[PDB]
Design a protein around this ligand. Structure first.
Ligand SMILES: Nc1ncnc2c1ncn2[C@@H]1O[C@H](COP(=O)(O)OP(=O)(O)O)[C@@H](O)[C@H]1O
Lengths: 159, 62
């Protein structure tokens, strides 16, 4: 969380080395969060209110005591907002998708209420398509000035 | 007398060269000791100035 907040604090694009001209647009940040506790949420909120980012960032907080299925909506909420703000208002959006392991357990739960035949270690057979439909809503467009850059976080279980 | 004075004057010339090497040694210490003091004071006011500019941009964004 500290490296992701550090990146989003100081990530800048260099036009001194490319010839673009300054015109410097900083980053909108779409900060999605799925089962953060309080101890990490207070870190990110203190970090953003210090470095002056809560005036350019939209926050989608799903704390870990909120019910454990609206994590299925939360990355799609954040990426719909990001696709809007990037591809129709020329921003340079950075999307922080916190801890996709919580999202993936949030849909192992649903996919084993339906007895859907799993991949390995219980996760359902279609999970690659869901992670694909989240991750591949990123990138630049030819003819526009917007962008969506994703830093998702993973917490690898037995690392 | 004068003879002992000329001899102790040769030795006083050695002693005067000895005070001159000691005095330029003390100077070569303390010229840059004073300048490291001012370099400290410069870098201190510059770090405080960086904190001031962060304070003003943060308060106006709030
Ligand atoms: N009552 C149920 N509740 C939850 N999931 C179910 C239920 N019945 C079937 N499913 C899951 O959904 C799938 C349903 O497939 P099927 O009923 O054969 O055709 P269709 O795709 O038209 O529903 C099954 O693979 C099963 O895993």
């Amino acid at each position: 969380n500290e490296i992701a907040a550090q990146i989003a604090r100081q990530a800048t694009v260099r036009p001194d080395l490319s010839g673009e001209g300054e015109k410097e647009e900083p980053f909108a940040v779409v900060f999605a969060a799925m089962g953060i506790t309080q101890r990490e949420l207070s870190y990110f909120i203190q970090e953003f209110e210090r470095t002056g980012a809560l005036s350019r960032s939209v926050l989608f907080l799903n704390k870990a005591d909120d019910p454990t299925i609206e994590r299925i909506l939360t990355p799609r909420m954040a990426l719909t907002v990001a696709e809007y703000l990037a591809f129709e208002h020329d921003y340079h959006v950075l999307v922080i998708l916190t801890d996709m392991t919580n999202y993936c357990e949030a849909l192992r739960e649903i996919g084993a209420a339906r007895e859907e035949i799993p991949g390995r270690r219980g996760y359902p057979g279609y999970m690659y398509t869901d992670l694909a439909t989240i991750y591949e809503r990123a990138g630049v467009v030819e003819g526009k000035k917007g962008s969506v850059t994703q830093i998702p976080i993973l917490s690898m279980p037995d690392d | 007398s004068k003879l002992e004075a000329i001899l102790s004057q040769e030795v006083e010339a050695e002693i005067q060269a000895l005070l001159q090497e000691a005095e330029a040694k003390a100077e070569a210490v303390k010229r840059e000791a004073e300048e490291k003091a001012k370099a400290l004071l410069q870098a201190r006011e510059r770090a405080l100035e960086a904190q001031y500019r962060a304070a003003l941009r943060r308060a106006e964004s709030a």
